[PDB]
Amino acid sequence: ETLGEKWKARLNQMSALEFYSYKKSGITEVCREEARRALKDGVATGGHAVSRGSAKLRWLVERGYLQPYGKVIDLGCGRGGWSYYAATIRKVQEVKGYTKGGPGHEEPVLVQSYGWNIVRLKSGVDVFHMAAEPCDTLLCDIGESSSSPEVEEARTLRVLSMVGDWLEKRPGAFCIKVLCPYTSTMMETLERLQRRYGGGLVRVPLSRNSTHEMYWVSGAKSNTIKSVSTTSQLLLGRMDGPRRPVKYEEDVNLGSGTR
Numbered sequence: 001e002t003l004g005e006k007w008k009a010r011l012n013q014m015s016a017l018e019f020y021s022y023k024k025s026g027i028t029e030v031c032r033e034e035a036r037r038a039l040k041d042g043v044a045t046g047g048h049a050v051s052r053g054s055a056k057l058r059w060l061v062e063r064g065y066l067q068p069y070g071k072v073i074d075l076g077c078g079r080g081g082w083s084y085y086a087a088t089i090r091k092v093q094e095v096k097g098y099t100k101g102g103p104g105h106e107e108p109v110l111v112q113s114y115g116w117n118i119v120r121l122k123s124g125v126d127v128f129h130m131a132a133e134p135c136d137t138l139l140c141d142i143g144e145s146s147s148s149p150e151v152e153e154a155r156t157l158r159v160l161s162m163v164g165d166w167l168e169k170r171p172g173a174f175c176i177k178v179l180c181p182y183t184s185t186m187m188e189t190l191e192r193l194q195r196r197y198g199g200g201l202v203r204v205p206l207s208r209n210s211t212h213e214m215y216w217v218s219g220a221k222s223n224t225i226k227s228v229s230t231t232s233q234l235l236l237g238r239m240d241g242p243r244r245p246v247k248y249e250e251d252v253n254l255g256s257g258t259r
């Protein structure tokens with residue numbers, strides 16, 4: 001049993017109150033409420049992000065873990081946070097997002113942030129039932145949580161299988177959600193994939209403690225085992241002391257206009 005698995009076990013064993021305190025203990029959070037007021041008022045200007053995702057991707061870019069450029073594919077784009085953020089980057093020329101939509105799933109949001117005209121979000125698409133196509137930047141944020149670490153592992157594995165085909169067209173720059181990187185098989189498969197395609201795992205502090213999600217990005221390079229175990233150490237450590245205050249931040253502004 002690995003540290004992450006012990007973390008998952010401890011997590012599931014927690015009482016609901018303890019879990020409420022723990023999920024956001026000491027994490028970085030972005031203020032979103034003005035963005036929700038504006039978005040539900042139908043304000044397409046003002047440069048509001050459609051989701052929290054834009055803050056995540058930003059965190060990865062501003063620290064040089066990936067450098068988006070050219071044609072960007074966003075698998076599981078959802079509302080389009082990653083896509084709309086990617087549209088604001090200089091070297092990025094075109095952004096194409098794909099999401100499942102329908103019952104239980106997010107629909108694409110139309111907004112006129114900077115570079116909205118080079119963005120196209122397609123809904124009603126199963127990326128698993130979709131032929132891969134060439135791209136400079138490969139983004140993927142698929143990985144639904146589960147109380148069962150085995151289910152999370154299986155879903156993550158299916159995701160990696162799916163993104164293999166896109167990666168063999170060889171970008172470039174990529175960022176891929178790894179929901180469950182804390183099992184033995186997962187870490188070994190990630191070692192393999194890291195030797196084949198490069199890149200490394202990175203924990204984003206905007207992530208909640210209730211998820212062990214890490215991001216496989218091209219501009220990172222690190223021992224998978226060590227970074228995963230470091231993350232696990234952080235999450236484990238945050239279960240013992242008092243509740244650490246939330247570090248609130250300003251949400252990313254994506255401006256307005258076309259390109």
Ligand SMILES: C[n+]1cn([C@@H]2O[C@H](COP(=O)(O)OP(=O)(O)OP(=O)(O)OC[C@H]3O[C@@H](n4cnc5c(N)ncnc54)[C@H](O)[C@@H]3O)[C@@H](O)[C@H]2O)c2nc(N)[nH]c(=O)c21
Pocket residue numbers: 011012013014015016019023145146147148208210211
């Ligand atoms: C609500 N919840 C979630 N988790 C754990 O957190 C992980 C990720 O959770 P999340 O990041 O999706 O966000 P959160 O759960 O806070 O809210 P959301 O609505 O997004 O998640 C709902 C999911 O939580 C899970 N869940 C609900 N109640 C419990 C519970 N009593 N024990 C374990 N898992 C639960 C269900 O699978 C459900 O699909 C889950 O895989 C689960 O093991 C919990 N653990 C305890 N001990 N008590 C909880 O109440 C709890």
Ligand SMILES: C[S@@+](CC[C@H](N)C(=O)[O-])C[C@H]1O[C@@H](n2cnc3c(N)ncnc32)[C@H](O)[C@@H]1O
Pocket residue numbers: 050051052053054075076077078079080081082083098099100101105106125126127128141142143
């Ligand atoms: C939570 S989102 C990511 C957030 C998004 N990047 C943003 O910044 O707004 C992940 C999305 O992937 C979508 N998804 C899950 N499985 C999918 C599949 N098989 N095909 C297409 N989209 C899927 C879900 O609907 C979900 O909205």
